[PDB]
Amino acid sequence: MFYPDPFDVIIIGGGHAGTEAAMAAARMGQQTLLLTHNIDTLGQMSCNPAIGGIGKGHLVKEVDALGGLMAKAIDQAGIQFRILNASKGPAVRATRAQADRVLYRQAVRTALENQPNLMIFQQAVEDLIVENDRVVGAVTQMGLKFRAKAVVLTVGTFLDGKIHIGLDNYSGGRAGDPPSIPLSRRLRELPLRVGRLKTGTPPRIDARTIDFSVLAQQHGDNPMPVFSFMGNASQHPQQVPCYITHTNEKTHDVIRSNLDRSPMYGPRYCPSIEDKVMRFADRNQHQIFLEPEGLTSNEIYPNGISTSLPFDVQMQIVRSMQGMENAKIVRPGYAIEYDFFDPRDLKPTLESKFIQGLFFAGQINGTTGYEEAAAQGLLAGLNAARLSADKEGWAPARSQAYLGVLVDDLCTLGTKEPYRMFTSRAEYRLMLREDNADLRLTEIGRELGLVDDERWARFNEKLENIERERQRLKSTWVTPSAEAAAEVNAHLTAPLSREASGEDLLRRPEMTYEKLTTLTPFAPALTDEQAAEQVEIQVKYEGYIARQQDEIEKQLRNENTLLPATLDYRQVSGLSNEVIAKLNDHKPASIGQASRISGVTPAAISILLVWLKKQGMLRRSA
Amino acid sequence: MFYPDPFDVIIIGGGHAGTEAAMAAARMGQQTLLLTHNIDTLGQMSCNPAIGGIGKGHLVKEVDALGGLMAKAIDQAGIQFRILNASKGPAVRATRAQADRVLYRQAVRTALENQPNLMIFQQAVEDLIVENDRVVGAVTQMGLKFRAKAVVLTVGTFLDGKIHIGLDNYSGGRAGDPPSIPLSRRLRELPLRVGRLKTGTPPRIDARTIDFSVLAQQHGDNPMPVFSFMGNASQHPQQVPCYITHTNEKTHDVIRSNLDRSPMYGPRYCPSIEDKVMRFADRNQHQIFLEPEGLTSNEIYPNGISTSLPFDVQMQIVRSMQGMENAKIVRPGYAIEYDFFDPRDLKPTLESKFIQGLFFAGQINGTTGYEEAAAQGLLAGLNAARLSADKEGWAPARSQAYLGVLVDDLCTLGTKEPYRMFTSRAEYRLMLREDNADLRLTEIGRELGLVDDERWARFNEKLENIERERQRLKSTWVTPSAEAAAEVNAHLTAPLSREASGEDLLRRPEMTYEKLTTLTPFAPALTDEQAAEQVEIQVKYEGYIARQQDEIEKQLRNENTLLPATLDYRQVSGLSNEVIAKLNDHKPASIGQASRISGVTPAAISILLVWLKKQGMLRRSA
Ligand SMILES: Cc1cc2nc3c(=O)[nH]c(=O)nc-3n(C[C@H](O)[C@H](O)[C@H](O)COP(=O)(O)OP(=O)(O)OC[C@H]3O[C@@H](n4cnc5c(N)ncnc54)[C@H](O)[C@@H]3O)c2cc1C
Ligand SMILES: Cc1cc2nc3c(=O)[nH]c(=O)nc-3n(C[C@H](O)[C@H](O)[C@H](O)COP(=O)(O)OP(=O)(O)OC[C@H]3O[C@@H](n4cnc5c(N)ncnc54)[C@H](O)[C@@H]3O)c2cc1C
């Protein structure tokens, strides 16, 4: 029954969050155990085979900078690479990759399979062990049960999910996988409010039944970009293009005629296609993408045609488009409904506020998307390994990582939509960029021992280059009567009228970095342009960064002021009943986090501070 | 409900037999449809990751010579290659390959995914449609149902199987896959007797917890062999070795002490390890192999340590061996029990004798092993596509293919052991070799349109080379007083005493082919040694081949004499009651097949022939 070796941390579910948690825990020198249903599914993509995008590439970069694996399994599995918002400011760009599925799966499995201090095990779980608000050990299906000092759950969408097609349904975790039914009931016993969500995916087409000779082609950028701060372009496999098609009035007529057979007729947008037509009935054209699932299989994923209608309607819609006159379907589209926990009963370190040692990550946190689970799993594993070693935990803030924004929003949002990350959703966009993620996370990774020697050396060299470039550019001066100043005035507006300097010379918006590096002064730029772009970004954004920094420094006291979960707001005088109920329901962790809740005003926080001072629950508030 | 396109043949289950059936049906110019649970499992190996062996390589060669895929997916996925019985006669050699699992899976999937006239579909089946002893169409789970003129079942071990560990059990098709329960009941309604069998597999070890520094290594053959008659050695990936270890008295003591916890305490041999110790208690040493599952994963398959004991005993046995003092297990060992049909109610063309158009192949035919299913599936698909096109079927005999022997034995054996192919199990070993499989099957493949142009050209060139070599060796003559005969007599015993010839010169057993080719006469041999070995084999085995040929030619009349399944042997005078019951139970297809049944004597067949002549059910018997 009892396994004769105790472990530090046990992860349940090796999906997109479990793998990151296991890697983070093992790399931090703690004995890690990973339980999963079945192997060869590690790194499986059950949806659009794409990585990154607007708001998703930032999470990938954050995971990579802190010692992740998603950014490294994509450099050897991407069949198309593009940069989004390339023409706009550098703070908003993103990198999106159409990925070969098998190469990604194998990269993930091989990287995870050779990780020291970690062991994997293929078995389901059926219950957990808890006594005195402490979780210790998990129970498998055969009868063998383990013991550990910390447990992380990354079930995802397998918590008692049903596949829905048309008006019919059947049990299933996803297309071809079984459901984890009993664990849903066992967790329902725990003091966690549980709800249900539903999302769908479209069918798959056969590439050798589509006449691509009349379909428009789309390509990526000529210089293929990279995700990780370590690899280069020599690791990418061969490239393939994408095909673009549209719909026509016959498809809309068929959808409207057969709209009766649907469970519906809901997010604030339109995920399906019948929603697309009904919400906007005047539009008569839509864009559909066809992209290959890999460079060695002829299955085409159609993007933009997701629905929940029965099979006949699906076939008619597929067969009523240009270039799809005679098409075959290998995998029917379908939706799935799964359980989740409301993210208002766990600490910002992704630990349940009621149980000691229990952590949550992945889809069960009311989110969606590959990138939205890797960061959660990595942080959960980090905190679990810190706790098992008896050291204080860690959690990022809204001003240093998109992960902090994600956690804070999931804690104090209260909406019902699946959580999708967007660039504008964070209030510190101007500094929470992609190229500087390592510069703001790798030192923390090193302090907690999540970064090995190669990354440390690379970052030290990059920082040295940045500092030397800054100093050398600060060490130049020019005058209007300078011997070489004629050409400087020729191709620069507003010619020099007084003592000039490169640090001030570049302040003009029209000038760039490489242009200044090509000059009689301002000697040739450093060979590592990756470090060179940093100085340009800093010089262009210095004023806004300074303003935001002195803004952030002011809320630090409210950030530090913690509120224990045992607090009973009914024992506070001067607060309205609605505010009391709201604060009792949310149970924030800090006064600043409470202030971010909708419905609380500065008067409420002032009264709360007075009450805290009265009860002595705060050392000081300055 | 009804799919708007009728197909020629529908295969249910894309495993090891379904893929071959689909390829054979599609390559024969018939619209083929393949239903499966889930994709990315095509080509999965759920047991020892090895291909070929004694009696299994012959089936692989037969499949390859007739247009198969197993022999082509192994040349790009094998990590170790060896020849068994290399020192013995060429008629008994075999080729065995330790294979990388992922490369095999991807080769299979990519080869199957680009097959013209074939389409794949991911869906389970829940029932079949039959009227008036005819099967037309199958029903899926969602509700969509198809129509076809022929149906082939390749379920394998998913027909309502249970996983067993120790004294506990749970539903499962295998480690990580769901069971197909309702189809088992639906097939129970069909007039086919059903039974249950059980077989197990050992656990998996972690390669980075085993001290291989004190373990013996094993190697293959430097001159690499080849499976397919098309590829070469340039397609094989990098090679890896295998490790060898043993057991000791502590393991036996632990097994004996904890023998109580076992469902048992059965094939005529000992599949498990506790059986190994109990059946032969005097032996105190056993051989265990450790082989890598691939060149990119550190999971080690242990061969020779299969069992059904609980997990604690498994761990003790693993930890009580040299080099395994501190070992980890990633996948526990387990057994499975599954349903099957008794192979006495189907025609030799793998068609049920009662239903029209229904075919059986794979594990459901009471067999085991990868190679034992591919041939069955290929033949079933061939016959189904022939039937759907309204042409006479085909079935090999015992004298031209191991498939004929396999089918004949499964029809008229009556034992309970899982059927494993062995070289000595066939009575025509001397001609049913491996190197000549194409020479005896590719012409039939071409006649039925299973062979494309490349194989046809290669075989035509090879046959031309063989014929020219035969003629040129027949066109030589030597004399004792020959000018170059001094050396001939020097290195050959019994010097020439009369007119000599190479066709007679090579008749000496000590002489070889290459030695004769490197002589004053008998100019250098042809560059294609693959064709050169054929003449050596023919000249060495001519007498035995001639004897066996004139033997086989005599039973052809009994082979041709068919016996309809509607025959009622109770209406025959002069036959004993036991013989009547036996023949009614078996219901053979030919008088020769009936004679191969145990318990029938020549008197019975003579009386049967007399009765047939009386009733006029035979045109003639000569
Ligand atoms: C029908 C469908 C629709 C989708 N729609 C969208 C969409 O609209 N937008 C979008 O962004 N993404 C969508 N997706 C993708 C989805 O968000 C991701 O595929 C996935 O849910 C996120 O990964 P995860 O790690 O959070 O969960 P999963 O990948 O589901 O995690 C499950 C993994 O953990 C293992 N596991 C789980 N529970 C256990 C347990 N108890 N014991 C052991 N092992 C366990 C499983 O074996 C598996 O490896 C969709 C997917 C499907 C199938
Ligand atoms: C516990 C265990 C022990 C084993 N022991 C041995 C051993 O001792 N010796 C040995 O040689 N082999 C052993 N094996 C391997 C196995 O017995 C066979 O060697 C081999 O797997 C045969 O596979 P198959 O293709 O015939 O069928 P399977 O792999 O069992 O299934 C065939 C395929 O058809 C699909 N399918 C089935 N039903 C349907 C349906 N209704 N609709 C759609 N698709 C369907 C399945 O999903 C699968 O992909 C063992 C396997 C297990 C799990």
From Swiss-Prot, chains A, B:
Any GO CC annotation of this UniProt entry: cytosol
Claim: Flavoprotein is one of the keywords in the record: yes
Cofactor(s) the record lists: FAD
Location(s), subcellular: Cytoplasm
Superkingdom of the source species: Bacteria
Positions that bind FAD: G13, G14, G15, H16, A17, G18, V125, S180, Q363
Pfam families reported in the protein's UniProt record: GIDA, GIDA_C_1st, SAM_GIDA_C
Entry's Gene Ontology BP terms: regulation of cytoplasmic translational fidelity; response to UV; tRNA methylation; tRNA wobble base 5-methoxycarbonylmethyl-2-thiouridinylation; tRNA wobble uridine modification
UniProt xrefs under SUPFAM superfamilies: FAD/NAD(P)-binding domain (SSF51905)
Keyword Secreted: no
Entry keywords, A to Z: Cytoplasm, FAD, Flavoprotein, NAD, tRNA processing
InterPro entries cross-referenced by the UniProt entry: FAD/NAD-bd_sf, GIDA_C_N, MnmG, MnmG-rel, MnmG-rel_CS, MnmG_C, MnmG_C_subdom, MnmG_C_subdom_sf
A GO term, aspect molecular function: flavin adenine dinucleotide binding
Residues reported to bind NAD(+): 266-280
Subunit comment: Homodimer. Heterotetramer of two MnmE and two MnmG subunits.
Role, per record: NAD-binding protein involved in the addition of a carboxymethylaminomethyl (cmnm) group at the wobble position (U34) of certain tRNAs, forming tRNA-cmnm(5)s(2)U34.
NCBIfam families in alphabetical order: mnmG_gidA
Family statement drawn from the similarity comment of this UniProt entry: Belongs to the MnmG family.
Descriptive protein name: tRNA uridine 5-carboxymethylaminomethyl modification enzyme MnmG
Species: Escherichia coli (strain K12)
